[PDB]
């Protein structure tokens, strides 16, 4: 045959591989360390027409790398902070009654304990206000203490691990970070408006770096996320399996106003030489329970849109019902998130309290604030959130939910969906749904009518 | 008739050099040695035999043993770094002798000490008790204190990691190669007539011992004796066994482990009341096979020290317990056996089991460092392990007895000899692909 | 009829850029970590560059900032394995010192007593130590506490390492070069007519001084004045000498170092007692040499302010002792000398030594770092230290009315100004081998 082989270096070819994507920011905030290289002012988004790439989630390594990277960043941020080891003492607490209300009865404890000063031989007696979710009674025996008696309490992390305290000079704001691919690798962005969780993307477009990915941390509702293009989306590994989380993405956002009406005061005591413990001071004004406000009409319309999209994956004549969480610890059974340095644990039982039949006003969500947070389902690495002075306000965009299908039903009856959220990787899976790293192979062979000339 | 120098790339030319070797292990929770982060090894390592080449191998000078010692020390310190430090344990202990089912040999070996320890709360303490061996406690003036109290504080080893010597392979980087001497009768120094290259060496178990080479590599055809100077009394003359003998070391005491909350989030695993009778730990070695191996050793020593010269194996010459007792690790606990029963004979020309009493220490200094120590936690249950000894680290005694009555006694406090008994066949060379040679060819002018 | 572009690889084209330089030492532990540094070349020959001038610019190059960060990092890393002085923050009952206290040292030394823990944490001991007045503060015989108790606890300096400044060399890596200037009339900035290329810079002494440059280089022709803006009094004036003067800083107090066992293995070296006589530490500099050196400064300094002007040397403007006093270190003892006797004269247009009272501080916090810091152990015996004054750091005053009476006071803003006086000739640069130039060449095609 008159055909011979010819080699071409530079051929466009793709291969699935795992690499260490580096970050990029628009540019103290040591949570991101600010040492990351800045992003380019003009991100080139090259469109790749006439080609279809098979995109698949729940197995992508970018979400796993982001989870490990944010864990390492959190550990590095908490590394130079002050350890709260001497705080494990017998706390003589009592219930607070200074302008207390009915809903906050017993939720705040006025504790008193001995503390160390800058000198080891001298000690000081300080007073702090700890929440009911941060203290546990030491000697629960010898009961019948007078109604107003100083019971003895201790921190929850005392018998697990003496962890650090979050430094006040750093902020936990979700600063967007862009994950870029190194040399010899590319990031393929699927710009399909109706992209489904697993399948070949019709319109694929490469890019050097992803868009602004805000590393928001939540368990039930996706806050400050990326909305859909034109219609809300629902994704799951196996829609017929009840053991898989049902990810949901919205197309329009619902404004949620979270606040803490307590005018908190922060007092700093010298726990030791050069180390200071920011304790909770006296409350100024009345004490009220922190909550979040969600519009009734907007939430009902969003729920109706989700119900409409839930009628195509299952039978459209099925009764879709919404129930609250099944139970467990407060880290998963409640909507946990951060709001201006203060951690909230909202009860979303009022949101998922409706049923749907195939035929202004607002709702208040009671939230509780906790100071000891493991933050990554750990058992020996927690953190202490210092109190924030003044009131706290937050305006977020709930762009999605992490639902869990409750199986066991039959004959297409009473199909209930409860909110869930296990690993924190599911929160970032709804943001990295369009990206997929690929390894390019510039070497390739082909036949052409050539031959090496003999010189 | 004309010659022109030409350049050849990729020539098979190597030179001796020093470099950092890789890590390689099977893909088979934690480990004190190379963890899961180590690079996995290939299931089919390539071994290319090389003929017509006589490489000059030389142990005791190669950087493989030094690099292994350095990275083993680094791995040990890195594994002990996140563990809980035992610095608040420096308190006065009111110890007393144990008499519950005591024996005639274990009298006074264990001390039942009680002390005031801090609990999870800073303003509260507890009165706990623990059983400490006599070798890690010293009197103050009933009041005792730890042996490491007046020195650097020890770090309690985490129970999650294990001291099991998982074999590792030292792979050479790109541009370097590992040459393995295939000669069966190859001693420590000399040109090996059968050298074969290899990408990565075989499984080297990082087991540390002081007098017997435990779980080592066996000789291919006969017992080999290697030493830098066979005429010098020093330099730690070591041997290698062609066949292994079984040794059964055990701790018959059914010990238990109790957890004491030393601090907030820290737990001090102490020793509780043992179940059953007490007994001294020992190692069993069959007299017949050990006598046969000793008979092979004298036969291999007579060719180096001359015939009709009677030789004598005796026990150590004094020093601390680390050099005078056969120290090793079995299941997690560290043993210190009196090996005087093995090296006790006099071999004269033309010629059921041996029990060795052992002592167990909790606070030890594994390496030759005073500022770094580690408290081994007591593991519950009966300890029992069977291993193979494939070599001894002997030492001669100076004298002018006209080459007669040569006394051989164990020793070798250095760990690098143990490490070198496996890395003797391997060496590191640096490949030099650039080469120049003349040929009758001229580059045309274009 | 035209030319064609022809590329050249390896052209001598430079571009100013910042690059992290690597160390180079003679390899003769050290506080600057000489072991963790690449050994220097036996003879780093220089390449003189003719027919070329390079625009040098000081106070903007990244070499001084890189050296500053390297010195801080090396100082912290060499201090990291030392023991921590955290239990020392307790109440100290101090009294004045006896044994013929002099008038100058009256109240400058205190005899503090405090309770400390022994090797056992359940036992206390009453130990005493001698602390200077600058290291203790009263609590409102009286109770005292260390000055580093409300800030961070300071690690003691390991006696095994020394504070002698070992000369280090900075070299540019592959693809970079460090050009050096060689003319005698070198300005602060501007072009240099004698530029030379050398692989590694000369021996830079990492000395820490705040008022007078110590153990530095000397000018080959005359005293030179360097400043970013000589008309601006906010910028420090860097002065260097051509002939250095000798200073004789002694510590007549013959003290004894006492080791206090504060914990397991760790020891706190405290000042035991003054067995000898008590006297104030001082530095001796000849009045004739200092007067001649000041006479050379005015001659080479009046060119920037006129000949008929009158300049006056005053002492420090006021502030902290560590920024207003000449701070250095000789043999482990940190001094703080009052230079009011040196800069005290008036110059008009045309027994023999000056003593300087110096204070001794143990808990010193070098650089501008506040949290991190160090405790200097007392050095036993009489301290003798001689050195060369190779430069000054001056600072002018504001106003500058009626074009006369220009008062000059010593400065001492940052440590960078010390290394700036030594790295004045050197400047890092980046080479570019790519070059484009036209010629009549044309590539032949097939």
């Amino acid at each position: 045959e008159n055909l011979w082989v010819t080699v071409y270096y530079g051929v466009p070819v793709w291969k699935d591989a795992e690499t260490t994507l580096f970050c990029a920011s628009d540019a103290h905030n040591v949570w991101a360390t600010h040492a990351c290289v800045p992003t380019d002012p003009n991100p080139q988004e090259i469109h790749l027409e006439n080609v279809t790439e098979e995109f698949n989630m729940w197995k992508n390594n970018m979400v796993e790398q982001m989870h490990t990277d944010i864990i390492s960043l959190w550990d590095q941020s908490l590394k130079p902070c002050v350890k709260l080891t001497p705080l494990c003492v017998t706390l003589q607490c009592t219930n607070v009654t200074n302008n207390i209300t009915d809903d906050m009865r017993g939720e705040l404890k006025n504790c008193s304990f001995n503390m160390t000063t800058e000198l080891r031989d001298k000690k000081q007696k300080v007073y702090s206000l700890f929440y009911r979710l941060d203290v546990v009674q030491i000697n629960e025996n010898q009961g019948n203490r007078s109604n107003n008696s100083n019971k003895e309490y201790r921190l929850i992390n005392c018998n697990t691990s003496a962890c650090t305290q979050a430094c006040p000079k750093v902020s936990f704001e979700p600063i967007p970070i862009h994950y870029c691919a190194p040399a010899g690798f590319a990031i393929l962005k699927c710009k399909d408006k109706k992209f489904n969780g697993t399948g070949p993307c019709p319109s694929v477009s490469t890019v050097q770096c992803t868009h602004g990915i805000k590393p928001v941390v939540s368990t039930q509702l996706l806050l400050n996320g990326s909305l859909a293009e034109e219609e809300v989306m629902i994704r799951s590994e196996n829609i017929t399996n009840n053991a898989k989380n049902i990810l949901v993405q919205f197309n329009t956002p619902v404004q949620i106003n979270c606040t803490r009406p307590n005018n908190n005061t922060r007092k700093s005591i010298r726990i030791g030489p050069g180390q200071a413990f920011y304790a909770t001071g006296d409350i100024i004004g009345d004490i009220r329970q922190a909550h979040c406000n969600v519009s009734k009409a907007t939430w009902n319309e969003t729920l109706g849109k989700v119900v409409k999209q839930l009628r195509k994956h299952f039978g459209n004549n099925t009764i879709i019902r919404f129930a609250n969480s099944s139970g467990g610890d407060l880290e998963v059974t409640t909507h946990s998130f951060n709001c201006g340095g203060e951690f909230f644990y909202c009860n979303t039982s009022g949101l998922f309290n409706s049923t749907w039949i195939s035929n202004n006003d607002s709702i208040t969500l009671p939230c509780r604030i906790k100071q000891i947070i493991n933050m990554w389902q750990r058992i020996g690495q927690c953190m202490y959130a210092p109190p924030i002075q003044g009131v706290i306000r937050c305006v977020s965009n709930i762009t999605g939910l992490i639902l869990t299908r409750d199986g066991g039903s039959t004959n297409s009856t009473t199909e209930t969906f409860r909110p869930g959220g296990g690993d924190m990787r599911d929160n970032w899976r709804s943001e990295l749904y369009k990206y997929k790293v690929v390894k390019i192979e510039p070497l390739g062979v082909a036949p052409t009518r050539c031959k090496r000339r003999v010189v | 008739e004309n010659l022109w120098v030409t350049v050849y790339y990729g020539v098979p030319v190597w030179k001796d050099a020093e470099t950092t070797l890789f890590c390689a292990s099977d893909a088979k929770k934690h480990n004190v040695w190379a963890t899961h982060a180590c690079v996995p090894t290939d299931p089919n390592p390539q071994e290319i035999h090389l003929e017509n080449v006589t490489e000059e191998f030389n142990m005791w000078k190669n950087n493989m043993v030094e690099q292994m010692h350095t990275d083993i020390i680094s791995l040990w310190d890195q594994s002990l770094k996140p563990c809980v430090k035992l610095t608040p344990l420096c308190v006065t202990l009111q110890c007393t002798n144990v008499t519950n089912n005591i024996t005639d040999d274990m009298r006074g070996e264990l001390k039942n000490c009680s002390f005031n320890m801090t609990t999870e709360l800073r303003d509260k303490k507890q009165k706990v008790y623990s059983l400490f061996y006599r070798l890690d406690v010293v009197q103050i003036n009933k009041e005792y204190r730890l042996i490491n109290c007046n020195t650097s504080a020890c770090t309690q080893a985490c129970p999650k990691v294990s001291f099991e010597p998982i074999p590792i392979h030292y792979c050479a980087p790109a541009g370097f190669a590992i040459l393995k001497c295939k000669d069966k009768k190859f001693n420590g120094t000399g040109p090996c007539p059968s050298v074969s290259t290899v990408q990565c060496t075989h499984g080297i178990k990082p087991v540390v011992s002081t007098q017997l080479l435990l779980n080592g590599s066996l000789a291919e055809e006969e017992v080999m004796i290697r030493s830098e100077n066979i005429t010098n009394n020093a330099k730690n003359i070591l041997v290698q066994f062609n066949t292994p003998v079984q040794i059964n070391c055990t701790r018959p005491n059914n010990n238990t482990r109790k957890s004491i909350r030393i601090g907030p989030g820290q737990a001090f695993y102490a020793t509780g009341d043992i179940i059953g009778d007490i007994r001294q730990a020992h190692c069993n070695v069959s007299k017949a096979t050990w006598n046969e191996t000793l008979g092979k050793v004298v036969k291999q020593l007579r060719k180096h020290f001359g015939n009709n010269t009677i030789i004598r194996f005796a026990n150590s010459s004094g020093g601390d317990l680390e050099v005078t007792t056969h120290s090793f690790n079995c299941g997690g606990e560290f043993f210190y056996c009196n090996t005087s029963g093995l090296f006790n004979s006099t071999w004269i020309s033309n010629t059921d089991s041996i029990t060795l009493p052992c002592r167990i220490k909790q606070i030890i200094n594994m390496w030759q460092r005073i500022g770094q120590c580690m408290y081994a936690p007591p593991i519950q249950g009966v300890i029992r392990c069977v291993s193979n000894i494939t070599g001894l680290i002997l030492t001669r005694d100076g004298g002018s007895t006209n080459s007669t009555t040569e006394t051989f006694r164990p020793g070798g406090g250095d760990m690098r000899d143990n490490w070198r008994s496996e890395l003797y066949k391997y060496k590191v060379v640096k490949i030099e692909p650039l080469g120049v040679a003349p040929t009758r060819c001229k580059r045309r002018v274009v | 009829e035209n030319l064609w572009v022809t590329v050249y690889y390896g052209v001598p084209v430079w571009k100013d850029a910042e690059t992290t330089l690597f160390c180079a030492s003679d390899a003769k532990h050290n506080v600057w970590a000489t072991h963790a540094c690449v050994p220097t070349d036996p003879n780093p020959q220089e390449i003189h560059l003719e027919n070329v001038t390079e625009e040098f610019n000081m106070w903007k190059n990244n070499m001084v900032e890189q050296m500053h960060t390297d010195i801080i990092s090396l100082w912290d890393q060499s201090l990291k394995p030392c023991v921590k002085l955290t239990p020392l923050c307790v109440t100290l009952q101090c009294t004045n010192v006896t044994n013929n206290i002099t008038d100058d040292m009256r109240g400058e030394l205190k005899n503090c007593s405090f309770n400390m823990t022994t090797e056992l944490r359940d036992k206390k001991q009453k130990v005493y130590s001698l602390f200077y007045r600058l290291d203790v503060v009263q609590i409102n015989n009286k109770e005292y506490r260390l000055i580093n108790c409300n800030t961070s606890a300071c690690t003691q300096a390991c006696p095994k390492v020394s504070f002698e400044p070992i000369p280090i060399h900075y070299c540019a890596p592959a693809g970079f070069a460090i050009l050096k200037c060689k003319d005698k009339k070198f300005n602060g900035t501007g072009p240099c007519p004698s530029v030379s290329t050398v692989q590694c810079t000369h021996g830079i002494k990492p000395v820490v001084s705040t008022q007078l440059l110590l153990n530095g280089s000397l000018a080959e022709e005359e005293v030179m004045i360097r400043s970013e803006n000589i008309t601006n009094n906010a910028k420090n004036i860097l002065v260097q000498f051509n002939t250095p003067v000798q200073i004789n800083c002694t510590r007549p107090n013959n003290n004894t170092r006492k080791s206090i066992r504060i914990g397991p293995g760790q020891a706190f070296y405290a000042t035991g007692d003054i067995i000898g006589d008590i006297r104030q530490a001082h530095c001796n500099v000849s009045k004739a040499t200092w007067n001649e050196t000041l006479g050379k400064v005015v001659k080479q300094l009046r060119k920037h302010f006129g000949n008929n002007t009158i300049i006056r040397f005053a002492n420090s403007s006021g502030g902290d002792l560590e920024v207003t006093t000449h701070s250095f270190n000789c043999g482990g003892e940190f001094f703080y000398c009052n230079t009011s006797g040196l800069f005290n004269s008036t110059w008009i247009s045309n027994n023999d030594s000056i003593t300087l009272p110096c204070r001794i501080k143990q808990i010193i916090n070098m650089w501008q770092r506040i949290g991190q810091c160090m405790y200097a152990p007392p050095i036993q015996g009489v301290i003798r230290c001689v050195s060369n004054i190779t430069g000054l750091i001056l600072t002018r005053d504001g106003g500058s009315t009626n074009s006369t009476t220009e008062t000059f006071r010593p400065g001492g803003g940052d440590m960078r100004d010390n290394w700036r006086s030594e790295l004045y000739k050197y400047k890092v640069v980046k080479i570019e081998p790519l070059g484009v130039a036209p010629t009549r060449c044309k590539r032949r095609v097939v």
Partner: antibody, heavy 136, light 112 residues
């Protein structure tokens, strides 16, 4: 030495509030582990613990007599006052007072005052006791 | 409340003869820290009660050496090696595990 003395009305009419004043000598209730108890004894019968007050104003009473007992103290004059409402004639007997402590110990390393247990650890000293007669 | 039982009601013994007073509880008095809380008190005729033993075995300061106590769980005995002519009186037991504290019925000691 530590001594305790009690005082109050010897003859108390029925259905009248009975008060008892206890004077502390040699010690103070402001100490980190001191606590004063109250035990009454009927004529020819067993003792009966009535109430106690801790250092942190922790008041403990009996289960059967919780609605009738009321204990209080002040750090000014260092005295403990026990109030008993609705006195019955069967309540006639000797009323004693006692002293107990948590036995706080000081550490040698750190200077924190610790303890081994958080209970009474025995009633060290006892008062002389007064005789309260409930009759018309 | 924890009911305390004391046997016997009366203990008539001769001087110099050993005697023992038994005691029981409804539940175990062992604290979570490993301490058994139980104390013994002696009430002399015409005098206020005084502490004898604390924490079952720890003797009080200034009390005679002849007084001793032992037991664990729900059984506690107060062993007296020698009974003197001054040791006559009422012996009471007490539990310090939890409030309210309950005393025993007493053990009157009278010379034979």
């Amino acid at each position: 030495l530590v001594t305790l003395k009690e005082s109050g009305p010897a003859l108390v009419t029925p259905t009248q509030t009975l008060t008892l004043t206890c004077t502390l000598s040699g010690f103070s209730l402001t100490t980190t582990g001191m606590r004063v108890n109250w035990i009454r004894q009927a004529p020819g019968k067993a003792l009966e613990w009535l109430a106690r007050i801790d250092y942190n104003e922790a008041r403990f009473y009996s289960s059967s007599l919780k609605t009738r007992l009321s204990i209080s103290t002040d750090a000014s004059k260092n005295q403990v006052v026990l109030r008993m409402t609705n006195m019955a004639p069967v309540d006639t007997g000797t009323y004693y007072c006692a002293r107990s402590q948590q036995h706080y110990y000081e550490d040698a390393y750190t200077f924190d005052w610790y303890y081994f247990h958080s209970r009474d650890n025995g009633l060290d000293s006892w008062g002389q006791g007064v005789v309260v007669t409930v009759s018309s | 409340d924890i009911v305390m039982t004391q046997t016997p009601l009366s203990l008539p013994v001769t001087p110099g003869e050993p005697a023992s007073i038994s005691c029981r509880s409804s539940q175990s008095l062992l604290d979570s820290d490993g301490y058994t809380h139980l104390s013994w008190y002696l009430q002399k005729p015409g005098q206020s009660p005084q502490l004898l033993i604390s924490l079952v075995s720890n003797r009080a300061s200034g009390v005679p050496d002849r007084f001793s106590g032992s037991g664990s769980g729900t059984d506690f005995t107060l062993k007296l090696n020698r009974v003197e002519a001054e040791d006559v009186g009422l012996y009471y037991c007490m539990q310090g595990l939890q409030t309210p504290y309950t005393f025993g019925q007493g053990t009157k000691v009278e010379i034979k």
